[PDB]
Write an enzyme that holds these catalytic residues in place. Sequence first.
Site, PDB file in Angstrom:
ATOM      1  N   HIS A   7      11.139  10.665   0.516  1.00 50.30           N
ATOM      2  CA  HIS A   7      11.411  11.842  -0.296  1.00 50.30           C
ATOM      3  C   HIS A   7      10.242  12.161  -1.214  1.00 50.30           C
ATOM      4  O   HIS A   7       9.299  11.375  -1.343  1.00 50.30           O
ATOM      5  CB  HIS A   7      12.666  11.629  -1.143  1.00 50.30           C
ATOM      6  CG  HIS A   7      12.574  10.463  -2.076  1.00 50.30           C
ATOM      7  ND1 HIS A   7      12.858   9.174  -1.687  1.00 50.30           N
ATOM      8  CD2 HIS A   7      12.205  10.390  -3.377  1.00 50.30           C
ATOM      9  CE1 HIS A   7      12.671   8.356  -2.707  1.00 50.30           C
ATOM     10  NE2 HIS A   7      12.274   9.068  -3.745  1.00 50.30           N
ATOM     11  N   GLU A  40      18.952  14.707 -12.912  1.00 49.98           N
ATOM     12  CA  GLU A  40      18.259  14.943 -11.655  1.00 49.98           C
ATOM     13  C   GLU A  40      19.190  15.501 -10.589  1.00 49.98           C
ATOM     14  O   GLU A  40      20.407  15.385 -10.690  1.00 49.98           O
ATOM     15  CB  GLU A  40      17.655  13.631 -11.148  1.00 49.98           C
ATOM     16  CG  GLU A  40      18.699  12.575 -10.818  1.00 49.98           C
ATOM     17  CD  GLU A  40      18.091  11.237 -10.428  1.00 49.98           C
ATOM     18  OE1 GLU A  40      18.848  10.337 -10.007  1.00 49.98           O
ATOM     19  OE2 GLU A  40      16.859  11.085 -10.546  1.00 49.98           O
ATOM     20  N   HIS A  65      -0.942  19.042  -3.146  1.00 51.92           N
ATOM     21  CA  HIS A  65       0.263  19.839  -2.921  1.00 51.92           C
ATOM     22  C   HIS A  65       0.974  19.556  -1.609  1.00 51.92           C
ATOM     23  O   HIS A  65       0.459  18.853  -0.743  1.00 51.92           O
ATOM     24  CB  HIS A  65      -0.077  21.338  -2.985  1.00 51.92           C
ATOM     25  CG  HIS A  65      -0.847  21.843  -1.801  1.00 51.92           C
ATOM     26  ND1 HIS A  65      -2.206  21.652  -1.651  1.00 51.92           N
ATOM     27  CD2 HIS A  65      -0.444  22.537  -0.709  1.00 51.92           C
ATOM     28  CE1 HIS A  65      -2.606  22.209  -0.522  1.00 51.92           C
ATOM     29  NE2 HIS A  65      -1.556  22.753   0.070  1.00 51.92           N
ATOM     30  N   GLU A 114       2.742  25.348  -0.567  1.00 47.94           N
ATOM     31  CA  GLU A 114       2.066  26.076   0.500  1.00 47.94           C
ATOM     32  C   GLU A 114       3.030  26.316   1.672  1.00 47.94           C
ATOM     33  O   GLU A 114       3.830  25.444   2.011  1.00 47.94           O
ATOM     34  CB  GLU A 114       0.852  25.279   1.033  1.00 47.94           C
ATOM     35  CG  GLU A 114       0.035  26.047   2.097  1.00 47.94           C
ATOM     36  CD  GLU A 114      -0.978  25.186   2.866  1.00 47.94           C
ATOM     37  OE1 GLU A 114      -1.484  24.188   2.313  1.00 47.94           O
ATOM     38  OE2 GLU A 114      -1.282  25.524   4.035  1.00 47.94           O
TER      39      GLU A 114
END
Lengths: 127, 122
Positions: A7, A40, A65, A114
Site C-alpha cells: 500500500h 486514517e 510521485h 500523474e
Amino acid sequence: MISGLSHITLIVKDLNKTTAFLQNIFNAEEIYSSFSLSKEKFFLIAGLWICIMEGDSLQERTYNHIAFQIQSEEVDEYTERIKALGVEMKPERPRVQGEGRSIYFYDFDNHLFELHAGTLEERLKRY
Amino acid sequence: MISGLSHITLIVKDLNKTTAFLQNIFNAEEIYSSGDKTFSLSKEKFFLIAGLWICIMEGDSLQERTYNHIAFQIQSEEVDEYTERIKALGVEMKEGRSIYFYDFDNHLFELHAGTLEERLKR
C-alpha cells in the site's frame, strides 16, 4: 523476495477534504475508517490500497510521485475533471519518442499525482 | 477509468548508490538506463520490483523525513531475514509485521508482513 506492492501512505492536514478529493477524481472506494491511534482511512483505487492519515507533516513539493494508468482516449476527460475541481495542474511536460501522454496535478498536501497514457513496452521498444 | 498503477518515480542524489540499494534489498531488476551529462540530460533508470515499474531520476534528496511512504509486501516468515539484510546496508531503521527504514535520500520505506485485506479485523 518482495511479493509486490502492499500500500501507499499519504499524510494530509484535512482527512475529510482529501477523502472527497480521492472519491471524486479517482472514484476511490473507502474500505476502512478509524478506538484508533490515529485518524486514517483506507481506500481502494484501481486495485491499489491507499492509506490516508491526518497529520501536520508536509513534504516539500518534488517529482517523487505515483503514476496511475489511464487510456489515451481518457486524457481530455480527466483534464476536464481536474479542471472542474479547481485542482492545480502542471503544464505539458517535455517528452521523448515512445513516451505517452500524461496529466499531472496536486492534492491539497503537496502530493503530485500523474495519470499516464503510455506504456513501458513502447518506452523500451525504441530504447 | 484508471486501470491501475503505471509506475512510481523517485528522485535520488546518487543513482549508482541507489541502484545498489534497490538491487540488494528488493532484488530490483534494472531494465532501462538513460542520461548524458555532456548533453545536459540527467540520469534516469527503470527497475522492475515484483512486477512494478520503478523510475529513478537523479536530483535532490527530500529535505526532511515525513511519514509519507511506500509499503512493499513480504512474508511474515521473512521479517527477521529482511531486518538483518537492511541492517547490513547501514541505513537507519525506525519478527512482527512491519519494518520501516530510509534510503539515502530520506525516503521512508515499509516492508509489510501480511495483507491489508487480512489486516481488516480491528
